[PDB]
A paper describes a structure:
[name] is a member of a recently identified oocyte/embryo expressed family whose members are characterized by an atypical KH domain. The SCMC contains a core formed by FLOPED, MATER, TLE6, and [name]. [name] is important in regulation of mitotic kinase activity and spindle assembly checkpoint activation, and contributes to chromosome stability, although the molecular basis for the relationship between its special localization and its unique function is not clear.
The crystal structure of [name]-N (1–124 AA) was solved by the single wavelength anomalous diffraction (SAD) method. [name]-N crystallized with two molecules in an asymmetric unit forming a stable dimer. The N-terminal 39 residues prior to the KH region form a unique substructure in [name]-N. This substructure is composed of a loop at the beginning (residues 2-12), followed by two anti-parallel β-strands (β-1 and β0) and an α-helix (α0). The peptide from residues 2–12 is located in a groove formed by the β-1-β0-sheet and the β1-β2-β3 sheet, bridging the N-terminal extension and canonical KH region, thus contributing towards the stability of the whole molecule. The total buried area in the dimer of [name]-N was approximately 1920 Å2 compared to 930 Å2 for the Nova2-KH3 dimer. On the dimerization surface, most of the interactions involve the helices α2 and α3. A measured molecular mass of 29814 Da was obtained with a Kd of 10 nM, indicating a stable dimer with high affinity.
Residue numbers in the entry:
A (entry chain A): 2 to 117
B (entry chain B): 3 to 114
Write the structure that this text describes.
């Protein structure tokens, strides 16, 4: 990616496109299976939404990950480029977590335009 | 955290499964009053509530918007179980029920 680094239970390196790698030797969550690292789902969001959706430095992401049983990885670049939220787990899960994050994004977008 | 927690649609908990919307709030597009006819209840130690949901439940409106489910928190003594009430349905192979008990589990552990 490029770096703002967001919090998560398992920090990953975004190597290239679909390739992610676990950084160092973290204690993994009981529900997390290394195999899920193979096919993550990506969804785009504008960058300014990231900290509204996930809190400052993505501080609420470990809670969300615990609730969803999917890893969340955030890649962010310039203000002019779309951010990428990458989601990791069983495909039956990645689909509905995808709708949840889209629904959350819709909400945060409305609040953004109201708080201004 | 308080005795009333935050939410998109503040409710009065009348008795058991019976709730009522307080006043005339603008409702979320995804929400319909008939949702209140499908409550599910979960129990939790009161101590976990502010860990799970933020001070005074300040994160609940985000959670509700993610889940498309209203969350009502009834709390009593620090002794007895708090009730979490949800008016669904779920967006995952995992019941909103299961996602919230799992959140509580994580928060129980992190509380050590």
């Amino acid at each position: 990616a490029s770096l703002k680094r967001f919090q998560t239970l398992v920090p990953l390196d975004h190597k290239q496109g679909t390739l992610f790698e676990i950084i160092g030797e973290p204690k993994l969550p009981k529900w997390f299976h290394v195999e899920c690292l193979e096919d993550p789902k990506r969804l785009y969001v504008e960058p300014r939404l990231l900290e509204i959706m996930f809190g400052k430095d993505g501080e609420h992401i470990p809670h969300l990950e615990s609730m969803l049983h999917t890893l969340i990885h955030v890649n962010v670049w310039g203000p002019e480029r779309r951010a990428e939220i990458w989601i990791f787990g069983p495909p039956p899960f990645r689909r509905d977590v995808d709708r949840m994050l889209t629904d959350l994004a819709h909400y945060c977008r409305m609040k953004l335009m109201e708080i201004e």
